[PDB]
Amino acid sequence: KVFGRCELAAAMKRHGLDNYRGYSLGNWVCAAKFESNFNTQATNRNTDGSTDYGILQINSRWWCNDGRTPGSRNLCNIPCSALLSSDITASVNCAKKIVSDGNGMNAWVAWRNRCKGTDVQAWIRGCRL
Ligand SMILES: [Cl-]
Numbered sequence: 001k002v003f004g005r006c007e008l009a010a011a012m013k014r015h016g017l018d019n020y021r022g023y024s025l026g027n028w029v030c031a032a033k034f035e036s037n038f039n040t041q042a043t044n045r046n047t048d049g050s051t052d053y054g055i056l057q058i059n060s061r062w063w064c065n066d067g068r069t070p071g072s073r074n075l076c077n078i079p080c081s082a083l084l085s086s087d088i089t090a091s092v093n094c095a096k097k098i099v100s101d102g103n104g105m106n107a108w109v110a111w112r113n114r115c116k117g118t119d120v121q122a123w124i125r126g127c128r129l
């Protein structure tokens with residue numbers, strides 16, 4: 001599923017990601033835009049052999065099991081394919097764990113390089129939330 005911008009904002013808010021660990025909703029929408037273009041089905045291989053999955057590009061070395069990643073910890077205790085669902089619940093639950101890990105949203109490279117320090121409220125401008 002390719003979410004619309006405000007559509008994803010509303011889903012993320014309903015799921016309690018807005019202001020989660022102090023990250024306003026625009027941060028999460030901005031991160032999803034650059035990580036996945038709002039596409040739940042997005043996957044990308046990493047150099048280390050792990051793969052990133054879903055709207056928030058959650059990694060198979062630490063967070064989910066994809067059955068092919070050396071050193072997988074599966075800390076979210078989920079198959080990586082569950083993170084590709086049109087229902088974002090599993091991605092949100094796992095993102096809450098990741099962002100609590102100590103580095104906040106710096107865990108997402110695209111967030112640090114493209115969202116951090118910018119006017120992230122722009123990402124939810126116009127939406128009815
Ligand atoms: Cl915001």
Ligand SMILES: [Cl-]
Nearest residue numbers: 021103104105
């Ligand atoms: Cl933080």
Ligand code: NA
Nearest residue numbers: 041042043044
């Ligand atoms: Na894909």
Ligand code: NA
Nearest residue numbers: 049050051069
């Ligand atoms: Na992989």
